[PDB]
Design a protein around this ligand. Structure first.
Ligand SMILES: *[C@@H]1O[C@H](CO[C@@H]2O[C@@H](C)[C@@H](O)[C@@H](O)[C@@H]2O)[C@@H](O[C@@H]2O[C@H](CO)[C@@H](O[C@@H]3O[C@H](CO)[C@@H](O)[C@H](O[C@@H]4O[C@H](CO)[C@@H](O)[C@H](O)[C@@H]4O)[C@@H]3O)[C@H](O)[C@H]2NC(C)=O)[C@H](O)[C@H]1NC(C)=O
Ligand SMILES: *[C@@H]1O[C@H](CO)[C@@H](O)[C@H](O)[C@H]1NC(C)=O
Ligand SMILES: [Cl-]
Ligand SMILES: [Cl-]
Ligand SMILES: [Zn+2]
Length: 583
């Protein structure tokens, strides 16, 4: 048993390093160069990695894991027993691989055209319309057009995708794909834990929602906003209304305290995508954390190519499983939003670099939420008016009015995201368990959009619509609950790191730049990779083991007080009791 187990793990690790590296190369080549040739080569490398996964997975299942002495070895073998998609018979596997490729390509190439006129891509064109347009009809054209072209096109693939991903999950001992995905957390209480955290953020979200709804009523008119109903989904400055910070101009608490056009500041000062990533790299090293290798700068795709290549523009970070080659792929735009995204992606890279010496099976975050949180933690400090001023992107600080303005800007991103990030996998888990059929995909999506976010579609949906498909993570088959987890725990990390850095005063005023004490907490946790259950890494960072909304609540407490006073004086009804309302 124990000698065979150790040898197996050693053999698994050295062979996986080679196969995964080769696969990552082909995957990268496709993602940064969408052609028939790179598609063919990718689909072929799929079969190579599946061969390897089957070989070692079949072998791993011969071990009685719960009868093994060593913890690290037992944990590796348990994981290898899960073949994931390689559990599918050859015919279903090739079909599944092709479906995944087809969905990603469809989404990444979709355009929205005026007749006899120009065609708009999602990045940057439609994103910019959603962020900057203040015309109801122009916002609707982009919102609907994007769903018409990307969402509807995904529908033909989705039922078969569901069938095949569920089949793979069952062949690996799970009840469905949702079961398989949730198991990434190793937390039996997950669904209830997440529900409790969501409920805790309700007073803050409802108050933000009511305040923003009033400001939209002001701008877009009484005929288009029901002050007791859900908010039309196209008015929040973002394609998915998942973050609302682009309508800051419509909702400024104290318009007498003006803040700098940060984008114009970045453009004027000649900021480029490369500069944005260099500044992120500097923040990590200021903490005593690792710099990205010279290779990163050579091989990364940090901006949309202009040589005619079709690419997957959605930001992502890549581990090539050799401990040397790490890359980011991002169609970076020069603005504050993408500066935050650059930091998020550099957090993934930092995690890769930190756990690079673990066996490849353990080269994952403590849970998927941890991997998402790292970059966002640093970005919280980056976002402070004090720090932005030090980058010469803001002029100031430290009036109460500028303070509530700052908290509002942060809430529009961080608070608004809470119900959306909770909502995506509530929908998918119910698709995977068979409670939502292909007949009810869209209707149940909107039911949840209403229930959790208090949003309504600006135009009634019809048969053939598949709005979930217009969101990257759906055709791309990337689990989403990690983002909800991330947003809760990143505030816990911020609080702990700030304490470790000797910050006193309001949490939202903390900037951990150059804190070696903060860097050390992060490094120790990240080095664990997936080697221990996640509460150990939580414990290392925060001095306790639990997920908790208390840090986020504390961060936003002065804003909650302000919102309650403001909403009360205008007599807002919190929530959307007129829930059937649409515009
Ligand atoms: C359970 O098994 C794990 C895994 O073991 C490893 O993989 C197996 C498949 C097999 O190949 C086996 O031989 C191999 O060890 C054990 O985890 C390892 O534990 C050791 C000792 O704790 C770790 O050794 C460190 O190695 C790293 C570099 O690889 C060094 O940084 C470090 O070097 C020194 O540390 C000492 C501290 O005493 C200092 O004096 C020095 O300054 C220097 O820093 C260690 O030598 C090793 O990293 C672990 N490997 C993995 C993969 O986790 C584990 O010990 C076993 N547990 C039990 C209960 O036996
Ligand atoms: C894009 O992919 C094609 C395969 O069709 C390849 O020939 C070409 O070299 C690639 N271009 C770049 C920029 O690498
Ligand atoms: Cl939608
Ligand atoms: Cl996840
Ligand atoms: Zn991420």
């Amino acid at each position: 048993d124990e000698a065979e187990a150790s040898k197996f793990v050693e053999e698994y690790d050295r062979t996986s390093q080679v196969v995964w590296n080769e696969y990552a190369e082909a995957n990268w080549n496709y993602n940064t160069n969408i052609t028939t040739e790179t598609s063919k080569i990718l689909l072929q490398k799929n079969m190579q990695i599946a061969q390897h996964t089957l070989k070692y997975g079949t072998q791993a299942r011969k071990f009685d894991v719960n009868q093994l002495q060593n913890t690290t070895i037992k944990r590796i073998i348990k994981k290898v027993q899960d073949l994931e998609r390689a559990a599918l018979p050859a015919q279903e596997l090739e079909e599944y691989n092709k479906i995944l490729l087809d969905m990603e390509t469809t989404y990444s190439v979709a355009t929205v055209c005026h007749p006899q006129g120009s065609c708009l891509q999602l990045e940057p064109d439609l994103t910019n319309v959603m962020a900057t347009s203040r015309k109801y009809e122009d916002l609707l054209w982009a919102w609907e057009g994007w769903r018409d072209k990307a969402g509807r096109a995904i529908l033909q693939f989705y039922p078969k995708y569901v069938e095949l991903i569920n089949q793979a999950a069952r062949l690996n001992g799970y009840v469905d794909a949702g079961d398989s995905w949730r198991s990434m957390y190793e937390t039996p209480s997950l669904e209830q834990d997440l529900e409790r955290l969501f409920q805790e953020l309700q007073p803050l979200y409802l108050n933000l929602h009511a305040y923003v709804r009033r400001a939209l009523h002001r701008h877009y008119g009484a005929q288009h906003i029901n002050l007791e109903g859900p908010i039309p989904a196209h008015l929040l400055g973002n394609m998915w209304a998942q973050t609302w910070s682009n309508i800051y101009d419509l909702v400024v608490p104290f318009p007498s305290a003006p803040s700098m056009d940060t984008t114009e500041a970045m453009l004027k000062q000649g900021w480029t995508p490369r500069r944005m990533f260099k500044e992120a790299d500097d923040f990590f090293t200021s903490l005593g954390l690792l710099p990205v290798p010279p290779e990163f700068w050579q091989k990364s795709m940090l901006e949309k190519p202009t040589d005619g290549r079709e690419v997957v523009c959605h930001a992502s970070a890549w581990d090539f499983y050799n401990g040397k080659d790490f890359r980011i792929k991002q169609c970076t735009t020069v603005n504050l939003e993408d500066l935050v995204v650059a930091h998020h992606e550099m957090g993934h890279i930092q995690y890769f670099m930190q756990y690079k010496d673990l066996p490849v099976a353990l080269r994952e975050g403590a849970n998927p939420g941890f991997h998402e949180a790292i970059g966002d933690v640093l970005a919280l400090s980056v976002s402070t008016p004090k720090h932005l001023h030090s980058l010469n992107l803001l002029s100031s600080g430290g009036s109460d009015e500028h303070d509530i303005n700052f908290l509002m800007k942060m809430a529009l991103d961080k608070i608004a995201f809470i119900p959306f990030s909770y909502l995506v996998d509530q929908w998918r888990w119910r698709v995977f368990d068979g409670s939502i059929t292909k007949e009810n995909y869209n209707q149940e999506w909107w039911s949840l959009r209403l229930k959790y976010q208090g949003l309504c579609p600006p135009v009634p949906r019809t048969q053939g619509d598949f709005d979930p498909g217009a969101k990257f993570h759906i055709p791309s088959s990337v689990p989403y609950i990690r983002y909800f987890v991330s947003f809760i725990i990143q505030f816990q990390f911020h609080e702990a790191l700030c304490q470790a850095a000797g910050h006193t005063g309001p949490l939202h005023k903390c900037d951990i730049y150059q804190s070696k004490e903060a860097g050390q907490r992060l490094a120790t946790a990240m080095k664990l990779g997936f080697s221990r259950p996640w509460p150990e890494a939580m414990q290392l960072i925060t001095g306790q083991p639990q997920m908790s909304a208390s840090a986020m609540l504390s961060y936003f407490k002065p804003l909650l007080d302000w919102l309650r006073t403001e909403n009360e004086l205008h007599g807002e009804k919190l929530g959307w009791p007129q829930y059937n309302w649409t515009p």
